[PDB]
């Protein structure tokens, strides 16, 4: 029956600031003994979840005091103050009073910083891959912020659609920036048929869109 609503799903915030996450339950969860079993966990990329807060406001063993939880009955809150790189990850509230126990939907906390332009690069397919009848052209967008960025591929000036995929790294631990790779996949025959391959980047860190290219020649 019980439902755990955690918001916001995503939450940007800059260094030193305060982040607050909410968690509501469709139904009260306090025990007769006065104990409220509402917890807060942090899961950093590639790691297992780690306990932060237990029984609404108790702070676990290796947790800096910047973190603190509060709340009553059906409304609970987690407040982080003076954020910093480390704090990056996904936070979850969890109700352990009722069975089945349940996790909130999660909150991805990201570090917001000063706009940075990406350094752009393009890579032609290796002769080695062409033998297989496939040509992958790669465009790399390095160290930029915000995450938002658009990448268009142009082959002999003609815009491409439906044959590229993008992949984004996690916010760098040091500088808080992202990196992105866009791969355009064509058949060998199609690649040999054209000459100019260009990667055009649009980002709120570039006055006018940057373009990198090469000639199959």
């Amino acid at each position: 029956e019980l439902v755990m609503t955690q918001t916001p799903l995503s939450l940007p915030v800059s260094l030193g600031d305060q982040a607050s996450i909410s968690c509501r339950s469709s139904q009260s969860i306090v025990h007769s003994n006065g104990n409220t079993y509402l917890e807060w966990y942090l899961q950093k990329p590639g790691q297992s979840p780690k306990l932060l807060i237990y029984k609404v406001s108790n702070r676990f063993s290796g947790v800096p005091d910047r973190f603190s939880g509060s709340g009553s009955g059906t409304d609970f809150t987690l407040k982080i103050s003076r954020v910093e790189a480390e704090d990056l990850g996904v936070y979850y509230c969890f109700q352990g009073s009722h069975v089945p126990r349940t996790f909130g939907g999660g909150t991805k906390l990201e570090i917001k910083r000063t706009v940075a332009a990406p350094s752009v690069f393009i890579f032609p397919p290796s002769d080695e891959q062409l033998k297989s009848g496939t040509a992958s052209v790669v465009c790399l967008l390095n160290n930029f912020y915000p995450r938002e960025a658009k990448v268009q591929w142009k082959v002999d000036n003609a815009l491409q659609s439906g044959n590229s995929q993008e992949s984004v790294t996690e916010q760098d631990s040091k500088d808080s920036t992202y990196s992105l790779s866009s791969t355009l996949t064509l058949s060998k025959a199609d690649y040999e048929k054209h000459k100019v391959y260009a990667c055009e980047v649009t980002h709120q860190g570039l006055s006018s869109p940057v373009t990198k290219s090469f000639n199959r020649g």
Binding site: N35, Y37, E39, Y41, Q43, S48, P49, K50, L51, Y54, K55, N58, F60, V90, Y92, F94, G96, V99, P100, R101, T102, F103, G105, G106, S119, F121, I122, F123, P124, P125, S126, E128, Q129, S132, S136, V138, L140, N142, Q165, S167, V168, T169, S179, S181, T183, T185, K212, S213, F214, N215, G217
Partner: protein, 219 residues
């Protein structure tokens, strides 16, 4: 000194079975409720169930999504926790974690174990170099890398110059292509004036298919 180590995960055909284990140490095992939680790639944590402690006869509880299919059990003499998974579906693919239910919560967690359910066979990856084309802008730093294409299942690991090269390295998350195989690229920055004089090698390791390739990225 509280530790939990899981094992047992891997690739399994659909409708198949698998038993996950979590060997614990550093605390009185029988005193605690123990839980299993899972996380599908890119999604939220999901509670699967718990098994009670000695004072409660080690009875079990389950989430609605696995009740009837997954069975939790424990070997108290060896202090091992188990998760028997039957009639496996594709949506059961995820990283599974066991947790000790201490500190009035889930205070110590396993390192997690990956489970992939699917009929697709173990396939090694093709490794191609990513090198700057004949046109190398008159800048300063030159990027280079490796394309690790069409492999299954995850995951792949990549390093440069036997770990020697680490700064400015970015190994992207793998994406599932139009077909069903995965692929990812790893890249690294370096000085434009260095591409030729020095040798850059990307070490691709893919345990699921015993592949270990070292691709020399030549200009």
């Amino acid at each position: 000194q509280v530790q939990l180590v899981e094992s047992g995960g891997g690739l399994v055909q659909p409708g198949g079975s698998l038993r996950l284990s979590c060997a614990t140490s550093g605390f009185t095992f029988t005193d605690y409720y123990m839980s299993w939680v899972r996380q599908p790639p890119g999604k939220a944590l999901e509670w699967l169930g718990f098994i009670r402690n000695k004072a409660n006869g080690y009875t079990t509880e389950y989430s609605a999504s696995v009740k009837g299919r997954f069975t939790i059990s424990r070997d108290n003499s060896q202090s091992i926790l188990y998760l028997q998974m039957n009639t496996l579906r594709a949506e059961d693919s995820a990283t599974y974690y066991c947790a000790r239910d201490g500190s009035y919560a889930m205070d110590y967690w396993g390192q997690g174990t990956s489970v992939t359910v699917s009929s697709a066979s173990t396939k090694g990856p093709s490794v191609f170099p990513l090198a700057p084309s004949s046109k190398s802008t008159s800048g300063g730093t030159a990027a280079l890398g490796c394309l690790v294409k069409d492999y299954f299942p995850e995951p792949v690991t990549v390093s440069w110059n036997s770990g020697a090269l680490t700064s400015g390295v970015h190994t992207f998350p793998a994406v599932l292509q139009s077909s069903g195989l995965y692929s990812l690229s790893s890249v690294v920055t370096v000085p434009s004036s260095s591409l030729g004089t020095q040798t850059y090698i990307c070490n691709v390791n893919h345990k699921p298919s015993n592949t270990k390739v070292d691709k020399k990225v030549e200009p």
